[PDB]
Design a protein around this ligand. Structure first.
Ligand code: FAD
Ligand code: FAD
Ligand code: NAP
Ligand code: NAP
Ligand code: NA
Ligand code: NA
Ligand code: NA
Ligand code: NA
Lengths: 329, 329
């Protein structure tokens, strides 16, 4: 456990589109801002679940690719300073006797005058490989996320999964790795058909329909045993790295342990976006109220409402209504 | 008075950015949509007051020119059918015994299952020329709006005002009209300095500091008498057309006569965006609630909230939550 003893003005739980616009608006109100995000990337549902898809109902965009929207939000907030804490899932939020919120994650303890939760459906986490010794290889050569293609250069790689992630990494690693194998439990992939076309055309070693049976290696993974689906025949791969792309899981989890008024897996908010805990606000898919719709455009309206009311809560001399952006820059 | 006997699903009062996105979302929910707007253009405050300025706090736009945002919204809604009624200010809204709303404007009577008011600060109207006989020349050769530059081709034009509108029309008409004069009550113009530079460089006849003293013409305006400010000297122009660009006025006006719960010139709404009158919703700058901020991004979140709840009000089989746009198109 580490501890950040800077009391931020606004600490945002979740770096999806709504959290990103919340962060931007915090900057507009000259507030110190921290984003805490479970994944090693920002972008929430858009980046994790449909980065390639075109969205048609965000105000002002006849169409926009989901990842492009996320990148635009990142560009928007780039004019201001934010502290971004990735690979941290908030487990505890408590308002201390002095009024300051203490937030504790799996890695670090944080402090804030206000908290704005923009957590969607809860903390995104990778689906884990359900093998007894799999955890022991985490932080060695068992990978759930890929942050650097070049670290596989000249190495033998096995990839588990049949989705766009597994297929994309396989094709991205083909020209870099010494050897790439992809293992999927079905002859049919989930990945986009054009990507699958490219996969079968490539020199990637496709193994279907197989599931991973065991990991052999005293310290580092050395061999991967596979078993055929609807067939009694084992396969053994000599590998240097194992990449697991079994998709994402989310749950509110400990979000339900903080004394919040929660209905139907959503945090209930007043029209100010404030929860039942003073100084604790919510916006986006995580929040609810009579008439709430889970949309990006709805979240993008809730974000500035939360920020501007948070600012007025912190500074009794500050007005809820912000100045015109057209003159501020 | 004319009468449109089609009962629309959603009738929107005001075609500013929030009304435009409301119209779009109506299409997304397969609702018949009408927009009624006071001005001969859509775009509200953006198009009327700052079309040239870059906005920095609309979600997903690092920067966007105000008129470009309006045009983007128009493009968004172009995929669906809307009936657009310009140059109509709604004066009366009444929910009839059958539950259908009757709306009456200066021109036309309309009917709707739901009304969503997106009126901002009230109906935009041009500042009128305060001369006893000025009204008699309306619809002849006295113009508050310019819809067609070419109808001034080869004609003698006088333009009143010192703002960007007066200056822009003067410069737009210079290569088209036989003769252009601009009359402003101050030696200093409000218009952007580069436009004023172009104005003084042009062949436009600049008359400052003058005010219009009287209109001569039995039927059509034939002569315009001007008087100098801080000076006793008259001027007489032979003109074919008079354009008055004295800017815009707005007021809620009759919006306060419809039985709505109004506080501080704003219509109070529940979190569904519904007013105190069932089936009558509000969004954007016209609405208020605890924590409301008058922003484009806020309005853009309120719009879909109003539409989706309006849809559920009209059709008890419809869910408030819409389908994903990413699959709908
Ligand atoms: C396939 C699909 C298509 C869609 N299409 C559309 C569409 O066309 N138009 C539209 O408007 N909407 C669409 N949506 C819905 C849209 O994605 C959501 O409204 C939007 O993602 C909500 O954004 P958010 O920032 O509130 O939440 P999210 O995007 O869910 O982001 C929340 C973030 O919070 C993080 N987090 C949560 N809890 C913690 C914690 N305790 N600690 C640290 N981090 C945490 C998560 O890891 C995540 O990154 C679609 C959704 C899906 C799945
Ligand atoms: C100079 C300036 C700079 C600004 N800068 C920013 C900024 O940087 N960021 C930001 O978020 N916001 C900014 N704003 C505020 C922003 O313009 C408003 O939040 C936005 O215009 C609200 O949109 P709207 O559709 O609700 O209302 P409006 O834009 O006011 O449009 C309402 C429309 O309704 C029509 N109408 C009203 N009543 C009737 C009636 N009875 N019958 C028929 N038609 C009617 C009006 O004619 C008008 O066209 C700025 C405003 C100004 C003036
Ligand atoms: N370029 C792009 O378009 C792109 C890139 C990345 C992600 N995405 C999108 O983001 C979302 C996430 O996709 P992603 O692949 O991470 O995850 P995904 O779509 O959920 O696919 C996960 C894969 O893991 C397999 N799997 C899960 N548990 C397993 C188990 N216990 N044993 C064996 N196999 C198991 C699944 O098998 P089954 O298929 O048999 O269920 C599936 O093939 C998807 O919608 C994807 O389209 C798109
Ligand atoms: N291309 C562009 O950038 C562009 C184009 C169009 C509009 N706009 C913007 O839109 C807004 C509207 O501008 P617009 O010119 O319609 O209106 P405006 O800026 O309000 O200017 C109105 C002009 O009318 C004059 N006026 C008003 N009443 C008068 C009276 N009774 N007698 C004499 N003169 C009178 C004013 O004089 P005084 O100045 O002395 O008060 C002013 O010069 C402005 O912010 C403008 O910048 C921008
Ligand atoms: Na997919
Ligand atoms: Na929710
Ligand atoms: Na101006
Ligand atoms: Na208002």
């Amino acid at each position: 456990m580490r501890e950040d003893t800077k009391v931020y003005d606004i600490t945002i739980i979740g770096g999806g589109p709504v959290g990103l616009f919340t962060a931007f608006y915090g900057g507009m109100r000259q507030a110190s801002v921290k984003i805490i995000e479970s994944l090693p990337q920002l972008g929430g549902q858009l980046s994790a679940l449909y980065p390639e898809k075109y969205i048609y109902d965000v105000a002002g965009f006849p169409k926009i690719r989901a990842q492009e929207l996320i990148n635009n939000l990142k560009e928007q907030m780039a004019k201001f300073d934010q502290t971004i804490c990735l690979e941290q899932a908030v487990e505890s939020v408590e308002k201390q006797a002095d009024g300051v919120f203490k937030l504790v994650t799996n890695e670090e303890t944080h402090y804030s005058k206000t908290v704005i939760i923009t957590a969607g459906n809860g903390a995104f986490k990778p689906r884990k490989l359900e093998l007894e010794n799999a955890e022991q290889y985490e932080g060695k050569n068992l990978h759930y996320f890929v942050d650097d293609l070049q670290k596989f250069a000249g190495r033998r790689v096995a990839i588990l999964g049949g989705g766009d992630s597994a297929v994309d990494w396989a094709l991205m690693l083909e020209p870099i790795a010494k050897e790439v194998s992809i293992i999927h439990r079905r002859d049919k992939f989930r990945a986009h058909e054009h990507s699958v076309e490219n996969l079968h055309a490539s020199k990637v070693n496709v193994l279907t329909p197989f599931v991973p049976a065991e990991l052999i290696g005293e310290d580092k993974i050395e061999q991967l045993v596979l078993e055929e689906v609807k067939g009694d025949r084992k396969e053994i791969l000599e590998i240097d790295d194992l990449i697991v792309n079994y998709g994402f899981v989310s749950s509110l989890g400990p979000i339900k342990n903080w004394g919040l008024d929660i209905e139907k897996n959503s945090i209930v908010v007043k029209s100010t976006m404030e929860t039942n805990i003073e100084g604790f606000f919510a916006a986006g898919d995580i929040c609810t109220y009579e008439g709430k719709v889970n949309l990006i455009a709805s979240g993008f309206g809730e974000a500035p409402t939360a920020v501007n009311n948070a600012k007025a809560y912190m500074d009794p001399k500050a007005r809820v209504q912000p100045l015109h952006s057209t003159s501020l820059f």
